[PDB]
């Protein structure tokens, strides 16, 4: 099995003990490390932080302590939007400019492949033709990578993609049978399935549907999403299940209404390290739990939630990671990916569960080490 670990190049700016750089990564935890994110300028891949080249070096130097480790560079992300991708795929010339820039960039800085993280073709302003043009892009990139391996006498660069977990986005965005032939791995973002945007509490990455959920609300679970990809053309062995090392926060309208689906207001509280309304890193979650939050096991969905006064948290812990790892193995998927390793308790000093408690759980469950 593969264990794919995202690292984010803005975690370095978090205060105090939240600051995270590549040398904080244990090189033996994962099989693949993915660097989030590169950007795009004039249809060419580019850095986006002043010290990206330094961090690339430190990142790819982790292979000095694990000969099996592979690294990928991810381009895009949620906050990148769609417009630069739409422009880039709109003409064969723009696609070739981009693919050529990618080959040179990955080889120069030591990466083993590219992770396309366009969120998403055919949605968020991207027009409908981008569903097919994304397939064209991936096909042309796979072919270009095959040719460059011939031309350089090196093992081929990998092409992977992070793909939507929401069914409407999937249907608007991906020609799954053809796309699946050319991608090496498909990183399914089976998280952010519920959040304060819905106006009521729910779990970030529930394995199963809640018992009363019907229709499209029953799409919002890992089991449905992964099986949707599998049964619409993607080989299980290429499908990678998404694991969040964060949870979503909510403000309850009434603290006595604190179950799944309880009404909420506003965007949810922010933590002192991640400083973004609506989510907490796992190490921030540990500070909430240790302060006396009430912990509940959502037995039907195999995930925890917790609440304290009017604060409500839907999250993942060691137990839910263990259950979901067992599930993905028994369903013959290719492994797991984590968003993101810098959100785990990497120092071990917040959760009293050892260093990297969540990532180590998957390392153990998937037989990585």
Ligand X SMILES: CC(=O)N[C@@H]1[C@@H](O)[C@H](O[C@@H]2O[C@H](CO)[C@@H](O)[C@H](O)[C@H]2NC(C)=O)[C@@H](CO)O[C@H]1O
Binding site for a copy of itself (CB under 8 A): 23, 26-28, 41, 63-67, 78-83, 107-108, 110, 124-125, 152-155, 266-267, 269-272, 275-277, 369
- Tell whether residue 76 is among the known ligand binding residues: yes
283 is in an annotated binding site: no
Catalytic member of 44, 119, 140, 311: 119
339 annotated ligand-binding residue: yes
Token pair recorded at residue 357: 């408690």
**Nearest-10 crossing angle of helices 318-330, 357-365:** 30
Is the previous residue joined to 340 through a cis bond, with omega within 30 degrees of 0?
yes
Q: Which lies closer to a copy of itself via its Cβ, residue 155 or residue 292?
A: 155
Determine if residue 40 is labeled as part of a ligand binding site: no
How far is C-alpha 40 from the geometric centre of its chain's CA atoms?
20
Measured CA to CA, the distance from residue 66 to residue 22 in angstroms comes to 14
Q: Tokens representing 40?
A: 């795009």
Contact of residue 153 among Mg ion, a copy of itself, ligand X, none (CB under 5-8 Å per partner type): a copy of itself
DSSP 218-272: GG-SHHHHHHHHHHTT--GGGEEEEEESEEEEEEESSTT--STT-BEESS-PPPT
Look at the block and give the residue holding tokens 């067992």.
326
Shortest Cβ 327–ligand X spacing (Å): 19
Rounded to a whole number of angstroms, the minimum distance from the CB of residue 96 to ligand X is 26
**Range 310-349, binding ligand X (CB under 6 A):** 339-340
| Choice between 276 and 322, CB closer to a copy of itself | 276
Region 246-305 residues binding Mg ion, contact defined as CB under 5 A: 256
Residue carrying structure tokens 């998404």: 242
Per-residue mark of binding to ligand X, 114-143 (x: CB under 6 A): ---x-x------------------------
In the stretch 207-246, what mask flags binding to Mg ion with x, by CB under 5 A?
----------------------------------------
33 interacts with ligand X by CB under 6 A: no
79 is in an annotated binding site: yes
Contacts with 46 (C-beta within 8 Å, 6 or more apart), sequence order: 38, 39, 40
Structural element, H or E, at residue 6 = strand 2-8
Residue 278 CB, shortest distance to ligand X, in Å, is: 6
Q: Which residue is nearest to ligand X (CB)?
A: 166
Q: How many angstroms separate the Cα of 249 from the Cα of each of 115, 202, 268, 279?
A: 28, 10, 5, 5
How far CA 279 is from CA of 29, 195, 294, in Å, comes to 24, 9, 18
Half-sphere exposure in the Cβ direction for 167 (13 Å, CA)? 15
224 belongs to an annotated ligand binding site: no
- Count residues binding ligand X (CB under 6 A): 23
CA distance 208 to 277: 26
The dihedrals phi and psi of 288, each to the nearest 5 degrees, come to: -65, -50
Q: Which of 30, 114, 189, 260 binds ligand X (CB under 6 A)?
A: 189
Q: Tell me which of a copy of itself, ligand X, Mg ion, none is bound by residue 256, counting a contact when its beta carbon lies within the kind-specific cut-off of 5 to 8 angstroms.
A: Mg ion
Rounded Cα distance between 248 and 279, Å, is 4
User: Any bridge partners for residue 160, and if so which?
Assistant: 115, 185
364 close to 336: Cβ distance less than 8 angstroms:
no
Of 113, 121, 165, 202, the residue at the interface with ligand X (CB under 6 A) is: 165
Residues 227-256 that bind ligand X (CB under 6 A): 246
Residue of 41, 46, 83, 197 interacting with ligand X (CB under 6 A): 197
**Does the annotation count 175 as an active-site position?**
no
Annotated binding site for chitin: 49-50, 76-79, 120, 189-192, 339
Active site residues: 119
For ligand X, the binding residues (CB under 6 A) are 6, 67, 77-79, 117, 119, 162, 164-166, 169, 189, 192-193, 195, 197, 220, 246, 276, 279, 339-340
Annotated binding site: 49-50, 76-79, 120, 189-192, 339
């Amino acid at each position: 099995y593969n264990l794919i670990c995202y690292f984010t190049n803005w975690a370095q700016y978090r205060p105090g003990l939240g600051s995270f750089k590549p040398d904080d990564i244990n090189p033996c935890l994962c099989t693949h490390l993915i660097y989030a994110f590169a950007g795009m300028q004039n249809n060419e891949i580019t850095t986006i932080e002043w010290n990206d080249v330094t961090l690339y070096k430190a990142f790819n130097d982790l292979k000095n302590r694990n000969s099996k480790l592979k690294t990928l560079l991810a381009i895009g992300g949620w906050n990148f939007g769609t417009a630069p991708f739409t422009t880039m795929v709109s003409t064969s010339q723009n696609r070739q400019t981009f693919i050529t820039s990618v080959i040179k960039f990955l080889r120069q800085y030591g990466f083993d492949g590219l992770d396309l993280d366009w969120e998403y073709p055919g949605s968020r302003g991207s027009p409908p033709q981008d569903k097919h043009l994304f397939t064209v892009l991936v096909k042309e990139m796979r072919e270009a990578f095959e040719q460059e391996a011939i031309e350089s006498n090196r093992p081929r660069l990998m092409v992977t993609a992070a793909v939507a977990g929401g069914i409407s986005n999937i249907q608007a965005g991906y020609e799954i049978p053809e796309l699946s032939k050319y991608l090496d791995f498909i990183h399914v973002m089976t998280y952010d399935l519920h959040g304060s945007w819905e106006g009521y509490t729910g779990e970030n990455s529930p394995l199963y549907k809640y018992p009363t959920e019907t229709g499209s609300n029953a799409y919002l679970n890992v089991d449905y999403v992964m099986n949707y990809w599998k049964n619409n053309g993607a080989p299980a062995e290429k499908l990678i299940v998404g694991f969040p090392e964060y949870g979503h926060t909510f403000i309850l309208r009434n603290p006595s209404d604190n179950g799944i689906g309880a009404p909420t207001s506003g965007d949810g509280p922010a933590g002192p390290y991640t400083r973004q309304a609506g989510f907490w890193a796992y190490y921030e979650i540990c500070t909430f739990l240790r302060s006396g939050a009430t912990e509940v096991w959502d037995a039907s969905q195999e995930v925890p939630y917790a609440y304290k006064a009017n604060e409500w948290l839907g999250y993942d812990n060691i137990k839910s990671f263990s259950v979901k790892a067992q599930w993905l193995k028994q369903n013959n998927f290719g492994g797991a990916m984590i968003w993101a390793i810098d959100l785990d308790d990497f120092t071990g000093s917040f959760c009293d569960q050892g260093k990297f408690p969540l990532t180590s759980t998957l390392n153990k469950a998937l037989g990585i080490s």
